[PDB]
Amino acid sequence: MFENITAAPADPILGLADLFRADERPGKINLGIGVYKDETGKTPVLTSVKKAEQYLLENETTKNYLGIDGIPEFGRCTQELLFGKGSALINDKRARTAQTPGGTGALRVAADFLAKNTSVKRVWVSNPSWPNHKSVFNSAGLEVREYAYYDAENHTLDFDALINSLNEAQAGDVVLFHGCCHNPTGIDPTLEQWQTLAQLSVEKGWLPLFDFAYQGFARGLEEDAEGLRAFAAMHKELIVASSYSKNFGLYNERVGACTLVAADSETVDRAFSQMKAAIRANYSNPPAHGASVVATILSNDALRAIWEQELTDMRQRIQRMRQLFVNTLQEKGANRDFSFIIKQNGMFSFSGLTKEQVLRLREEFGVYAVASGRVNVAGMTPDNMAPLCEAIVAVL
Template identity: 60%
Template sequence: MIFSEVPQALADPILGLNDAFRADPRSDKVNLGVGIYKTEAGDTPVLDCVKQAEALLLQQESSKNYLGIDGVPAYNQAVLALLFGAEHTLCVNGRARAAQAPGGTGALRVAAEFIRNHTASRTVWISNPTWANHKNVFETAGLTVQEYRYYQAKDHSMDFAAMQADLAQAQPGDIVLLHGCCHNPTGIDPTQTQWQQIAQQCLQQQLVPLFDFAYQGFGAGIEEDAAGLRLMAETVPEMLIASSFSKNFGLYNERVGAVTLVAENRDTCERGFSQIKHTIRANYSNPPAHGALIVSTILHDETLRALWHSEVTQMRERIAAMRELFVASLSAAGVNQDFSFIARQNGMFSFSGLTTAQVARLRDEFGIYIVGSGRISVAGMTRENMPVICRAIAAVL
């Protein structure tokens, strides 16, 4: 009997919260935990560009044969173009290769195993705070996780000096995880000047950047949000990128992501990418087709691509409007504390500053579910649920 000794795993801090929300019988409950975009009606929509692409695929698809290990070729080309820009020299010179992966998490895991099994690197530096699953992904792959300070609680800002000081302790070859845009959970991103300084620090200390790029288009725009990543790619000789289309295409359950390798020359890239594929083969053999075919169909069709840009803009602008309304509604609910910083943050999340005890009261007394760290999914707010949320927060402050 070997299974009787297996201990109970702790509930996931985000998906476990989702389970608790579903089990809650209250009709006025609100889920602001998981990062899923909601419309003003509280729905998670299928984008129009996605529906049209799926209709085309239904007409054109002739086989359900296996994909190659690295997935849909047209999809991987589209990934590189979104990351670096069309006809970027990295791609022309063969220094960058992308492989389709099952979501951003799958891409991170492939990157982690590639690092652990095929390089001398053993340490990954992650921001404090960061996405709850980062540490789990890297440690499960056998890597050591260190943290660099990122957030300054007293004024709800980025502690850039502390970040630089902590990364100064990193050793050559260490991996530095960076959020490409819309930092999760703080919503605070480096300025372009700060990105330049981060890139120079990585270059000088021979650190290897690993970008988690899950929210392209949700910050300032599809092209604008890639600015830090592109600057880094022009500065350092090698890097890794884990990207995802769950949010900006609304393809949450299709698990559409990619792992991209950038190397110092074509030969090194080809050898490294062969090991990326070897890692994929040992994990899930090859990826599922449908989500990647949707994305590649949209990005290779001028009309559908323009529609996608429009729909991403609509989502981004609605989230920004909810940030402004959140700040105003907290004030209207009698909260004297200054929450204006929420309107300055980017992306789906706000790092509210609420304590663990306050978060627990919101859940237990009011049916408002947010992550224990105080991270709130602004993308789940609507004009209808906003008064309920803000009255509850006023009560626990």
């Protein structure tokens, strides 16, 4: 019976959506989005994907079910993108990929797999990290502990505090790492920090779990993977949850992949059969559309050439706004040092605004942002940069 059922809380970011689409003062800027927007403030469907879709519309002959792990071409394409084209992990066949409904679905299936087939109990999530991370692991029954990460003072990665908090984790604990473009800080470890982390991860016996939802948004496709590749060359086992939502603009088609890595082909096949069991009990088989689109794009090099360009254009727009944000702030005039913004990668960063400030921002100006002071840089156009910086400067 449902009458004494507790109403679910307001999702941190969803409340904003509604308040924004209510604010009758149209000079309003929504910075708590999470999705990429072009200079027009529009989230378009990539040309490569549209071409890909016409191709599928012309060539599909059936809608019959995919296998639990999805379209195979999609699988090999994802692990090549992740580990590199000549990666030993691929050659020795010690990796297996299951196509899943978005990066979140990949995280849930990993969670269920881990919860039913191993003795992992705790999962270490960075502080801060994407909020849905806790809920995902919690629903699988795993407990979430947090390691330090953000130096609120210097707006940086507090490595010392970081390694110092991980020492609290036992061998057997799963440690969640953001591949690149840390959500919500945009601070990523340098390659040397990744390596010390890889080294320490082996000595302490953690099971690395990479959340890779922004490949291509920090430096490039290969560059962004260098961190995970540092771990994958040092570990016998690891799990990587990747999303194609942002980098292919396929948000609503739900396309991601959960990749398993084990010591050998024999062991990976045995563990993968159970991961497939977890999928069958969840949604049975994955949604073919978004994945078909990614599979055909990445495999037709004419189409892959166009996509790559569309992604570097996306990446560069974001980098121009982080850059243009810093100095438009220095023109509107305020005691500051927002240059830390330029050092950060991806669509996000903590502006360093107090919840009090972010509040008067929404209230007195119509500039919307998430309470944590997290701001989506892709929500800034060269046009709305001025009023944005004026408002920000007027609340400091």
